[PDB]
Amino acid sequence: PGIVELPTLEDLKVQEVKVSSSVLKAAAHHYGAQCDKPNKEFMLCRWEEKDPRRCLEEGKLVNQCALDFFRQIKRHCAEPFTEYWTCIDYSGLQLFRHCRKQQAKFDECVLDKLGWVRPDLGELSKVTKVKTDRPLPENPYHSRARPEPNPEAEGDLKPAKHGSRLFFWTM
């Protein structure tokens, strides 16, 4: 019994970034490097509040920053990125292994056109510290008041009054 509150359709009307999974995979490392702040803030909100109905604005801002990143890569390094993501898309598993020359062209293009460097191995998987300004959810699980603990057992022990007190056994 209650209300399943749901934000109206207007709040979740994001611009809906539209690139295929192969295109996303091609720009994975550079996007993670130069877009880490919105992703990290949004995910910390998601993990702390534990309520996607609450951190929708961070979901907006992450999409805004992703679209800005893709607009920059469109404006500066369109051709190498296009060839690289097409060559990634050809593979069934989308492995970076086969596509290394196009990766080199894309990397040098973004390095000398947008000042970017790909993260080294394992750099993109380190736990980061975010400087979010939202408060800490006091009751993320919405837990009710806990039952009071049972009365604690304490006190000095003396011999049982009149022994066992079990039938004729006096002692």
Residues that bind other proteins (CB under 8 A): 15, 17-23, 67, 70-71, 73-74, 78, 81-82, 85, 89-94
CB of 64 to other proteins, least distance (A): 12
Contact 71, 158 (CB under 8 A): no
Q: Which is nearer to other proteins, 50 or 98 (CB)?
A: 98
CB of 91 to other proteins, least distance (A): 6
Q: Which is nearer to other proteins, 96 or 137 (CB)?
A: 96
Phi-psi region of 156 (alpha: psi -120 to 50; beta: other; left: phi over 0): beta
CA angle 116, 117, 120 (to 5 degrees): 155
Residue at token pair 């973004």: 110
CB of 115 to other proteins, least distance (A): 20
For residue 93, give the DSSP letter: S
Q: Which is nearer to other proteins, 91 or 132 (CB)?
A: 91
Q: Which is nearer to other proteins, 92 or 149 (CB)?
A: 92
C-alpha closest to that of 107 among 40, 28, 35, 39: 28
